[PDB]
């Protein structure tokens, strides 16, 4: 749930312990080497993101240890180490543990970790793969998995029929034969009936899957336009669909007209407009499948002021929802912030 | 006290939804929509679980036929 | 073609089980037992999913009461 | 599914690539430095675990075909970074599970077999709760309770206004309704714990239905190995099941029914191997590795055990590593490993 604290020793730029105490809701980070705090959590969490200190006005280091205070519904410590050679350990409340063990209360998605590159990760990607982001928010991916295996399972039961059709023709001609053939084709006829109606089921389920998809896709459209204005003030914003049908494998375009320039294509928009639109997009996807962890890594650096304001505004208002830790050099957020920790390059931090 | 654990929490869950959202009018709200999604996606997923198991027994029964 | 995706694969899944295990006698087999477990644990888990969601709305509805 | 191969470079004792080709079902490993191959997979999977220039990377690859041929490969350096690649494209770790949960494999060493036998009989039931598939309920039930206290505290906070409201048009219309509604609310609350009961009945019904099966096979497998004796798994606090414990008692042939350890020998060994074949019966997995596990068994023992795997083939893929003779010729395919280390048939 709401993160209590982060303990930091020997990690990247971090010489001494610098412990960070992490309020519920909004929190802040200032610098021109500060960037590395997201990476900490990012890394302790296990998502993708030298890795140990070595700073030359100080002796190089062979371990890195980072700790997540992080209270759940108890206070639960999640802590991660690495060495040369080196081993790596995992400790819940400082007792050593496995990694599958990390998820647990995580799945019984989770957090979002947002940097400037991820915001390009999206905008750039060929509009085919993008729908994955909506499939994910439409919660429709699990169906897609099991459906997929039920099919691979279905071809099995299929091939056995063909193998059965083979004896049936060989059986065209004592007491053995007639009693069997009468039954064999009796039973196989029953079997292809089962098979048929399963695909039937996949249809309906594919109807719900898509019903599921765009029911959600429509909601994400509403908020995309509504949030776009709350930031640009305003313009229109829509998310198109290449191949409106063939939905399951169809694509999603993102078109935005910031105030001034007419409704047109992203990028050739340029600016920190093409930035803002995505921040707008993200607040809105966050509306359909929210998560109680959000970090933002120097994301508003292309926005101009009142922009930076309205964005920072949005987080000011996004408080009681999820815990927000944003890291930036920006002024709009800094005073609109709640709690700041300064980080200055070896690096050091406190209020 | 009888019937099931399940249907009884269905009598229930149903009775709650109405008492929160479907109260006079039935006002669609951001967290009402959320509520239906979370619920309406589940049923698909549960269905998809019985879907895998269904196809399974078929391959199995398909298989007992032949040696 | 009607009713649900689900109950129809229930008519089904039920019909398969019987055709494999519950065929004359109903012989308990190592992989029959397995079959029931995998199935009978599921229902508990599904129920436990609706269990969490039930308690949830309660805290929610408990909460609308007061400011 | 059934592992195709393991590519090995720069890992622990491994200088050159030594690639291992891993048949379906039974497979083997010989040595007096061989021990490190389990560790490879163990490590690539993500579970806990002089004459040449030192090395700053380690790269291990899982060929491993699924229902396609799917490569699972893991690297580490000094500083150092670590990468993750499915079919040699870089990936995240949550991404590792997927087809894993949509448990999995068992990895068995001599220490894990002590990990079990030693542990205070309280915690042990976790192994049966896990096979009784009853742990998931236990999670959600747990959160529904923590959720239930919430809805509870709000009532108390509501009971408070109700007494303050003991005394215009506002009051009476509200109080009439307030206690109308709260009365309805405690009705909901009550019956939820009701539900937890029934679900706890099924949870335990679920537990020992499975616990009974694991008992049968424990005794049946014990004999197939010792030939025979009795083996049972007791229950400390027969009721209070959910938090009760599990003792493990065995009488190998000869010595009467008595307590493990003071049994000693590779008897106390064998019983656990027996136990494990049997837990494997209730929640099987298509991956099993065994790290020098039969080293306390005497021959015909080593035989019958090795026998069991000889017969356990079409079930799951078995990779066992040992210096033992019973298994080696009863094996399917052997790879020699000799200390830097090297391997092939």
Question: Can you walk through the features of this model?
Answer:
The PDB classes it as cell cycle. The entry lists the keywords cell cycle. The assembly is tetrameric. The complex is a heterotetramer, with 2 copies of chain A and 2 copies of chain B (67 residues). Chain A has 351 residues and is of the alpha/beta class. Chain A folds into 2 domains: 1-125 and 217-351, Rossmann fold (3-Layer(aba) Sandwich); 126-216, Helix Hairpins. Chain A contains 9 helices and 14 strands. In chain A, strands 7-11-12-2-13-14 form a 6-stranded mixed sheet. In chain A, helix 8 (306-317) links the parallel strand 11 and strand 12. Chain A is globular and about 95 Å long. Chain B is mainly alpha-helical and 67 residues long. Chain B contains 2 helices and no strands. Chain B has helices at 5-20, 30-64. In chain B, 25% of the residues are buried. The chains are: A alpha/beta (351), B mainly alpha (67).
> Main sheet of chain A, how many strands, which sense, barrel?
6 strands, mixed
Query: Using only CA atoms, what is the Rg of chain B?
Result: 19 Å
| Percent in strands of chain B | under 5%
How many beta strands in the DSSP annotation of chain B?
Answer: 0
The structural class of chain B is mainly alpha
Rg for CA atoms of chain A: 27 Å
- For the secondary structure, the number of strands of chain A is 14
Q: What's the number of helices of chain A?
A: 9
- Termini separation of chain A comes to 24 Å
Helix content of chain A: 40-55%
- The count of helical stretches of chain B stands at 2
InterPro entries (chain D): P-loop_NTPase, RecF/RecN/SMC_N, SMC, SMC_hinge, SMC_hinge_sf, SMC_prok
GO biological process, one term (chain D): chromosome segregation
Function (chain D): Required for chromosome condensation and partitioning.
Family (chain D): Belongs to the SMC family.
What descriptors fit this protein?
heterotetramer; A: about 350 residues; alpha/beta; Rossmann fold; Helix Hairpins; six-stranded mixed sheet; five-stranded antiparallel sheet; about 45% helix; about 15% strand; B: about 70 residues; mainly alpha; Single alpha-helices involved in coiled-coils or other helix-helix interfaces; 2 helices; SMC (chain A); P-loop_NTPase (chain A)
């Amino acid at each position: 749930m709401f993160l209590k604290r982060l303990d930091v020793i020997g990690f990247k730029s971090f010489a001494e312990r610098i412990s960070v105490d992490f309020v519920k809701g909004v929190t802040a980070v200032v610098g021109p080497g500060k960037s590395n705090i997201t990476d900490a959590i990012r890394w302790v969490l296990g998502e993708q993101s030298s890795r140990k200190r070595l700073n030359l006005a100080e002796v190089t280091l062979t371990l890195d240890n980072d700790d997540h205070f992080l209270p759940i519904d108890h206070e639960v410590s999640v802590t991660r180490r690495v060495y040369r050679s080196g081993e790596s350990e995992f400790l819940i409340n400082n007792q050593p543990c496995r990694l599958k063990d990390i998820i647990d209360l995580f799945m019984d998605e989770a957090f979002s970790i947002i940097s400037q590159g991820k915001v390009e990760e999206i905008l750039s990607s060929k509009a085919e793969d993008r729908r994955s982001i909506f499939e994910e928010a439409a919660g429709v991916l699990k169906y897609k998995t099991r459906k997929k295996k039920a099919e691979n399972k279905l071809f099995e039961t299929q091939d056995n029929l063909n193998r059965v059709e083979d004896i049936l023709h060989e059986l065209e001609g004592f007491e053995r034969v007639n009693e069997r053939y009468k039954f064999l084709s009796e039973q196989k006829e029953d079997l292809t009936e089962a098979k048929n109606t399963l695909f039937q089921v996949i249809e309906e389920m594919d109807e719900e899957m898509t019903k599921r998809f765009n029911d959600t896709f429509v909601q994400i459209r509403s908020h995309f336009d509504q949030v776009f204005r709350s930031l640009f003030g305003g313009g229109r914003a829509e998310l198109r669909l290449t191949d409106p049908n063939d939905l399951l494998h169809s694509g999603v375009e993102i078109i935005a007209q910031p105030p001034g320039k007419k409704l047109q294509n992203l990028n050739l928009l340029s600016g920190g407009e093409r930035a803002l639109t995505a921040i707008a997009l993200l607040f809105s996807i966050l509306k359909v499948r929210p998560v109680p962890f959000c970090v933002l890594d120097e994301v508003e650096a292309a926005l101009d002021e009142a922009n930076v304001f309205r964005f920072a505004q949005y987080l000011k208002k996004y408080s009681s929802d999820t815990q927000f830790i944003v890291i930036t050099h920006r002024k709009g957020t800094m005073e609109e912030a709640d709690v700041l920790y300064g980080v200055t390059m070896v690096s050091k931090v406190i209020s | 006290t009888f019937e099931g654990p399940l249907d009884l929490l269905l009598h229930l869950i149903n009775r709650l939804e109405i008492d929160i959202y479907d109260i006079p009018v039935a006002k669609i709200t951001e967290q009402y929509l959320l509520y239906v999604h979370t619920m309406r996606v589940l049923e698909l997923d549960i269905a998809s679980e019985y879907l895998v198991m269904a196809a399974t027994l078929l391959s199995i029964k398909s298989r007992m036929l032949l040696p």
